[PDB]
Amino acid sequence: DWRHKAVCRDEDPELFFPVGNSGPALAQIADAKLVCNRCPVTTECLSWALNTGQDSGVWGGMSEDERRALKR
Amino acid sequence: TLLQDQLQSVLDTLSEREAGVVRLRFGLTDGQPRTLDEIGQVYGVTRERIRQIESKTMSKLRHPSRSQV
Numbered sequence: 603d604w605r606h607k608a609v610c611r612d613e614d615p616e617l618f619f620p621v622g623n624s625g626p627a628l629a630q631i632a633d634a635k636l637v638c639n640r641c642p643v644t645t646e647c648l649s650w651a652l653n654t655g656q657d658s659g660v661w662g663g664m665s666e667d668e669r670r671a672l673k674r
Numbered sequence: 675t676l677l678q679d680q681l682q683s684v685l686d687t688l689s690e691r692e693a694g695v696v697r698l699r700f701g702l703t704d705g706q707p708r709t710l711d712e713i714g715q716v717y718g719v720t721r722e723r724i725r726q727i728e729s730k731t732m733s734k735l736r737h738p739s740r741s742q743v
């Protein structure tokens with residue numbers, strides 16, 4: 603199981619759920635993506651998020667708007 | 675249970691209305707899930723709003739940062 607190797611397990615979970623407050627949380631999305639960029643299971647995380655339809659949050663180095671644009 | 679602790683942690687990140695919606699939906703507070711209609715009456719929210727609250731909450735629960743492996 604790839605979740606054993608998730609490095610976000612050592613982070614504040616809310617980092618991966620930025621709230622747009624009168625605008626895109628560009629800085630917080632970037633801060634979450636920086637974690638994903640040093641994660642060994644990024645492709646597995648993204649694959650699972652896409653295949654199960656996780657609509658909220660940053661998964662696998664992609665923001666929710668990016669994943670949403672991927673699926674129509 | 676670790677599920678219990680993580681569930682309460684996730685609920686703390688929500689607004690009071692959103693957390694109440696989730697608790698009535700899953701029956702976490704008194705053991706009785708409520709229908710979407712009663713949740714709507716109680717919190718003045720639409721079926722669609724309930725669905726998006728639930729989707730966001732489930733995403734938070736299933737995110738690998740909180741994972742109970």
Ligand code: SF4
Pocket residue numbers: 607608609610611618637638639641642643644645647648660661662663738739
């Ligand atoms: S890719 Fe990002 S969200 Fe997925 S497990 Fe790795 S750090 Fe966590």
